Design a protein around this ligand. Structure first.
Ligand SMILES: COc1cccc2nn[nH]c12
Length: 288
């Protein structure tokens, strides 16, 4: 696509913002607010449309975990509700395979889910698939070569270095090599042939480290760390570079956006969000 969209998030309370960053000229555009504020959601794009999945509305009126799926059309600048998931999923992870949205893990109150469900936009229906081997909230999800990966998180008792892969034609999850770092709330994405995990919280500190899993060699390798430690960051890929957005560094809700160039193994600051926030959903599609 052309723009990096950030939806929702948290600063003092859950947020409704939808804002779009254009890497080609540095500009930010404020677009139509989400109908319901939410943090801990995930974003993804299918068929040019932006989807906001899950989350939680932390507000003075109370706290409500979200089973919602909502769809933003850049052509109209309007959000439309879609079918809701089987369960609320705060701190969810999502990935897209073959035009279907997989919703992974997350929490509903004290319930930490291992369940996973798949949304078919052509039918506006969700269906449960095989659950993960581990309960995971704050889980990072990415897709490579039509396989789905769930990375890190929190199982209700422990933060996790483990990761697992879903094989759709077998409707089966299998563990993969664990990361070298415990990470909940990391940013997880794919670049070339590797699954990247950036940042997160290891139980003691917010992290700046970044490691990547080569699906051929089944090993994790550290790359250059981010300039800022951050948990509950948003992450996406644009033009072969990783962008990380916001998060919490143990002191401030960050407005920093950093960009990773894999050829030089360096991170640089490329813009600031209009306000600091964590727990955003992020995805890339065409300008509105
Ligand atoms: C303050 O302790 C925490 C709990 C859960 C997630 C977190 N991310 N950064 N700090 C965290």
């Amino acid at each position: 696509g052309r723009l990096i969209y950030t939806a929702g998030g948290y600063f003092r309370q859950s947020l409704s913002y939808l804002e779009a960053y254009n890497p080609s000229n540095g500009s930010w555009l404020r677009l139509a607010d989400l109908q319901v504020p939410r943090s801990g959601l995930a974003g993804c794009v299918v068929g040019g449309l932006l989807y906001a999945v899950g989350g939680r509305n932390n507000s003075p009126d109370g706290n409500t975990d979200s089973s919602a799926l909502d769809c933003y059309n850049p052509m109209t600048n309007q959000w439309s509700p879609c079918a809701s998931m089987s369960v609320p999923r705060n701190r969810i992870g999502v990935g897209v395979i073959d035009g279907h949205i997989y919703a992974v893990g997350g929490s509903h109150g004290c319930i930490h889910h291992s369940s996973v469900e798949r949304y078919e936009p052509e039918r506006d229906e969700w269906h449960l698939v095989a659950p993960m081997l581990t309960r995971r909230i704050g889980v990072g999800v990415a897709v490579l070569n039509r396989l789905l990966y769930a990375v890190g998180g929190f199982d209700g008792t422990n933060r996790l270095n483990s990761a697992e892969c879903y094989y759709p034609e077998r409707n089966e999850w299998r563990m993969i090599t664990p990361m070298n770092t415990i990470r909940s709330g990391a940013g997880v994405c794919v670049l070339h042939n590797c699954i990247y995990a950036a940042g997160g919280y290891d139980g003691q500190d917010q992290l700046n480290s970044v490691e990547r899993y080569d699906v051929e060699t089944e090993t994790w390798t550290f790359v250059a760390p981010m300039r800022h430690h951050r948990s509950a960051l948003g992450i996406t890929v644009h033009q072969g570079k990783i962008y990380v957005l916001g998060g919490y560094d143990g002191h401030t809700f960050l407005d920093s956006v950093e960009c990773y160039d894999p050829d030089s193994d360096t991170w640089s600051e490329v813009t600031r969000m209009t306000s600091g926030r964590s727990g955003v959903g992020v995805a890339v599609t065409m300008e509105p």
